[PDB]
Amino acid sequence: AQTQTHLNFTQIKTVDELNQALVEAKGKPVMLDLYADWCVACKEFEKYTFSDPQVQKALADTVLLQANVTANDAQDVALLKHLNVLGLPTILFFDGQGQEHPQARVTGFMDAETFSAHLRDRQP
Structure with missing residues (x-):
């Protein structure tokens, strides 16, 4: 279509920023996605799994x-x-x-259905 709905990720760069985010998320579950432009599976995640409505x-x-x-x-290496x-x-x-x-x-690509199951059964 002309538009698409995407998850709104908060970008972090350092270990300190990660800690600040955790402190702020007191009482809520947190998910951290590690992405790189050279990582094909990562792009597939962004394009086909994180874009799924479910x-x-x-x-x-x-x-x-x-x-x-x-x-x-x-800073990337340190993180x-x-x-x-x-x-x-x-x-x-x-x-x-x-x-x-x-x-x-999660260390490998997962389609929308497999990832949804992971969240249901494994997310803390």
Whole structure:
């Protein structure tokens, strides 16, 4: 169509900005998407999974964060080490207390249906 509905992600660049966002999200679940222009699976996520109406509805009460590590500068490297991420794509989930749940990580592409199931069954 002429227009499209997208999830409104809050962009973060550093470990400190991530912490500030967690503090602000007290009591709410948080999802962090790690994206890079060279990561094909990441683009597929943005274009086909995060654009799905059912996926967007399932994330209605979740704080959405996103980090663009394309440049791969000092701050990007520091953020990835802090989170203990091996590669992209990687989507992390934090609970209302601000703690991550490693078992809920998504590390490969997932279509709208598979991702919706993950949220239903695995999101903290």
